[PDB]
Amino acid sequence: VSLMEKLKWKIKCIENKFLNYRLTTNETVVAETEYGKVKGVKRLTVYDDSYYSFEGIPYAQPPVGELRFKAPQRPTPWAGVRDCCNHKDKSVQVDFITGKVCGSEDCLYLSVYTNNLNPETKRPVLVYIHGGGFIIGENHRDMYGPDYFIKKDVVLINIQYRLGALGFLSLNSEDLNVPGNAGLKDQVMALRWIKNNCANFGGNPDNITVFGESAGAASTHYMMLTEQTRGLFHRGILMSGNAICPWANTQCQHRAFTLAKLAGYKGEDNDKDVLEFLMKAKPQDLIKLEEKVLTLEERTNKVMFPFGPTVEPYQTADCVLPKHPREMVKTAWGNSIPTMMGNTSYEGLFFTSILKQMPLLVKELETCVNFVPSELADAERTAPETLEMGAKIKKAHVTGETPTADNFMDLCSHFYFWFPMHRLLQLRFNHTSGTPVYLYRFDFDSEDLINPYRIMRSGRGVKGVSHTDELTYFFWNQLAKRMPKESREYKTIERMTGIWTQFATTGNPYSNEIEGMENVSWDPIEKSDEVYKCLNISDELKMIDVPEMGKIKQWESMFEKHRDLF
Numbered sequence: 001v002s003l004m005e006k007l008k009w010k011i012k013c014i015e016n017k018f019l020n021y022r023l024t025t026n027e028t029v030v031a032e033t034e035y036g037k038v039k040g041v042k043r044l045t046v047y048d049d050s051y052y053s054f055e056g057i058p059y060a061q062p063p064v065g066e067l068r069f070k071a072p073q074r075p076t077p078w079a080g081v082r083d084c085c086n087h088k089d090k091s092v093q094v095d096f097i098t099g100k101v102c103g104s105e106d107c108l109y110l111s112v113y114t115n116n117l118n119p120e121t122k123r124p125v126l127v128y129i130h131g132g133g134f135i136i137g138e139n140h141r142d143m144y145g146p147d148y149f150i151k152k153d154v155v156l157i158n159i160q161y162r163l164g165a166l167g168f169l170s171l172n173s174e175d176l177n178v179p180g181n182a183g184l185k186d187q188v189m190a191l192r193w194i195k196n197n198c199a200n201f202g203g204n205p206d207n208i209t210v211f212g213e214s215a216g217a218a219s220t221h222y223m224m225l226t227e228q229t230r231g232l233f234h235r236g237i238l239m240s241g242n243a244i245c246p247w248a249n250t251q252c253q254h255r256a257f258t259l260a261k262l263a264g265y266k267g268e269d270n271d272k273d274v275l276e277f278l279m280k281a282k283p284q285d286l287i288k289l290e291e292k293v294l295t296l297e298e299r300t301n302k303v304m305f306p307f308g309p310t311v312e313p314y315q316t317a318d319c320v321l322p323k324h325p326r327e328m329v330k331t332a333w334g335n336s337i338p339t340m341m342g343n344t345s346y347e348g349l350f351f352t353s354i355l356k357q358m359p360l361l362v363k364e365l366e367t368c369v370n371f372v373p374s375e376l377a378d379a380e381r382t383a384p385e386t387l388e389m390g391a392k393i394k395k396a397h398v399t400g401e402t403p404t405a406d407n408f409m410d411l412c413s414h415f416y417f418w419f420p421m422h423r424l425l426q427l428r429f430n431h432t433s434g435t436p437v438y439l440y441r442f443d444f445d446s447e448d449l450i451n452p453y454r455i456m457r458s459g460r461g462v463k464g465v466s467h468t469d470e471l472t473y474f475f476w477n478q479l480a481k482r483m484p485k486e487s488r489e490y491k492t493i494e495r496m497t498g499i500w501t502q503f504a505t506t507g508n509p510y511s512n513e514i515e516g517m518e519n520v521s522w523d524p525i526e527k528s529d530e531v532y533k534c535l536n537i538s539d540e541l542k543m544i545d546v547p548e549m550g551k552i553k554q555w556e557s558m559f560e561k562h563r564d565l566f
């Protein structure tokens with residue numbers, strides 16, 4: 001934590017609510033939701049654009065009291081019209097910036113945005129699911145401002161969903177109705193709301209795109225894997241993540257007890273007693289203590305979060321994940337909608353912050369055994385097979401006699417993003433109706449325009465395109481500024497929102513109408529492809545073989561003798 005970005009974060013807090021005020025108009029509007037009417041308000045962007053803004057729409061019953069750790073329940077209608085000109089609070093979480101908990105349990109809301117409430121054409125609807133490891137994030141416009149997308153004639157919807165233990169507690173006992181994935185169930189209920197309500201904002205319920213970055217990307221994929229959402233939407237975009245990323249799910253049924261004990265539970269390990277204690281604890285206490293739940297062994301084996309998406313121990317009405325994500329790929333309805341996937345060109349640069357607090361992590365590259373996929377590794381990671389597997393990884397990333405911080409982050413790009421994408425693509429090809437998947441590689445590097453993640457990762461002054469760097473060209477945030485029409489930043493905003501709107505609209509990301517894309521020929525990946533092709537998005541828009549391919553193949557060779565596990 002740092003006292004300085006504590007003050008000037010809390011200076012642009014003042015000036016993002018004052019800027020918010022100024023950019024509001026007195027033009028208010030009312031729309032008919034399934035649950036009753038809602039009151040919006042037209043707002044302004046620094047590019048003198050304008051959109052109708054509906055924030056605070058509840059899609060679920062506030063999951064408080066006896067509803068805590070439970071699946072969302074559809075909320076309660078209302079005669080008259082609900083206020084929606086202000087946002088609700090975010091899910092309870094730790095503020096990376098201040099170190100203190102903020103947010104509320106009352107957080108199951110979404111926001112709807114569009115430049116025209118009655119177009120005389122039913123528009124494509126884009127649903128954004130934020131990332132944040134399933135433990136942080138919000139749909140607030142200070143991080144996810146719709147200002148750029150509303151230049152396009154679509155309807156943009158940003159959802160929230162329960163985070164951390166309040167979202168992802170999982171208990172084995174079938175009597176307790178806490179199977180897990182409450183946060184994903186929030187997503188599903190929100191999708192259902194959007195399918196049955198977008199029309200009333202000008203959107204075509206037959207043309208809906210779900211997209212997300214990081215945990216939002218894994219969320220999007222879960223929404224494409226689960227049988228709960230069959231047909232709800234028609235295109236998916238996976239931005240730097242998917243459901244079979246190692247960080248994207250965890251078997252956490254045994255950790256509820258640990259959380260309880262950290263919170264001062266007295267008694268033995270019994271799901272009923274543990275749940276009863278947890279049900280009554282303060283929400284801020286659980287969430288703050290979450291950072292202590294993982295054992296040293298779990299951390300060493302690269303378990304990144306204690307609570308997250310999980311394979312549910314018993315099926316119920318609202319079950320979202322009955323089997324392992326890999327197995328769900330086999331019958332996943334979403335394998336048969338237009339899909340786009342991509343990563344930035346230096347993902348693992350995101351880990352500068354964590355490397356600096358723990359430089360000993362670099363020594364892990366001496367053998368790389370800690371990065372061998374856990375399904376393949378032995379528990380102590382001392383088996384000679386494990387050493388061999390780790391040697392393949394080392395050969396892919398360690399470039400001198402001693403590993404460097406950069407070899408580490410390059411490795412991290414693959415462990416956390418490229419290799420799981422490869423596994424998904426290949427697993428998908430063996431269970432797909434044959435609908436195209438397009439790859440992008442975001443490779444546009446700038447420090448003129450940024451987003452708050454750069455502060456967390458302390459990538460201020462560091463070159464390369466980190467994980468989350470691309471958000472900047474998609475969403476307004478409080479650190480953003482009006483950029484010159486002819487700036488490389490402004491042009492990238494146009495290209496990104498353009499490509500994304502084009503893909504949403506048509507299920508094909510190519511458009512001759514996008515600046516820089518004239519000679520692009522964006523072909524999707526085929527099962528027969530030995531080398532992945534992607535649109536490299538830089539100052540130049542360029543189709544290239546994925547540079548990361550050789551390393552991807554090298555990781556793949558760890559499975560030479562365990563092909564069934566790949």
Ligand SMILES: *[B]([O])([O])C1=[C]C(Br)=C([C])[C]=[C]1
Pocket residue numbers: 131132133134213214215216241247304416468
């Ligand atoms: B994303 O910001 O949800 C994300 C974050 C981390 Br710390 C990792 C390992 C993957 C994706």
